[PDB]
Design a binder for this molecule. Sequence first.
Ligand SMILES: CCCCCCCCCCCCCC(=O)O
Ligand SMILES: CCCCCCCCCCCCC(=O)O
Lengths: 137, 136
Amino acid sequence: MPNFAGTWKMRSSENFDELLKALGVNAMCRKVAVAAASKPHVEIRQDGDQFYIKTSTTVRTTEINFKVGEGFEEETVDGRKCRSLATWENENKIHCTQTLLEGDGPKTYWTRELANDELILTFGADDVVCTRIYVRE
Amino acid sequence: PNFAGTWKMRSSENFDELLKALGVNAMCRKVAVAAASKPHVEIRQDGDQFYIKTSTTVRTTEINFKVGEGFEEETVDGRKCRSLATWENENKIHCTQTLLEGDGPKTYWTRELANDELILTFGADDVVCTRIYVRE
Ligand SMILES: CCCCCCCCCCCCCC(=O)O
Ligand SMILES: CCCCCCCCCCCCC(=O)O
């Protein structure tokens, strides 16, 4: 029912450096990630529950393909392989639960919500929350 | 010796081990080693006065120094340091470093001209990384 599809550009970021610190990312990498990941561009294709999400920066591009309610594999923000499940949390919000394939680490998740035609991306690592707001371009 | 010119890296040794000695975690080392795999360097030199720009797609650094005079730069892992370059021989500059802030391994770099190749060495405690540059 909500239409996530389109091209998006990041307008604002809260607590990204703190999220990377909670994931144990070294400052050498955080310094580049915070500079470069200051202006990601996102493309979404959506057909009902079926999604394609591509996030690109000069430093790193990721693409995921998933159906809401079906398991898939992706990476955490710090690049660790995880098994994921996206659920509708409400009519305008996808909540994605994540479990590491290998090893131990903080509990991670992401959410994507459409609110007043803005795309709110939240990432969790234990009790740390990062909020990135995307707008249409 | 004429360090001036444009240079491209042909080989690297022990960069992963150097970043480990600097306390960089494995996931970060894998990305950093890849990101640093082929820097392009521009040097301008006028006697003892040096300008060194090192560029990669993800990160560019520039330093200006005179041999024998203190300056401030960053370690490889991006920690602010106070530095001093000296001639170790006719074709070799040795740069001693001290952290401005916090504690960490003893670091230094050397740049040497040998058979018109540019040999960059980084030290962190007893670990040595060697990077060899050739003229572009
Ligand atoms: C998220 C990406 C983090 C990337 C951090 C690596 C930064 C580039 C290192 C450049 C080292 C060049 C050393 C040299 O002068 O040969
Ligand atoms: C080991 C290095 C980990 C650092 C991660 C870099 C991430 C850069 C781009 C992330 C984009 C986040 C977003 O979707 O807004």
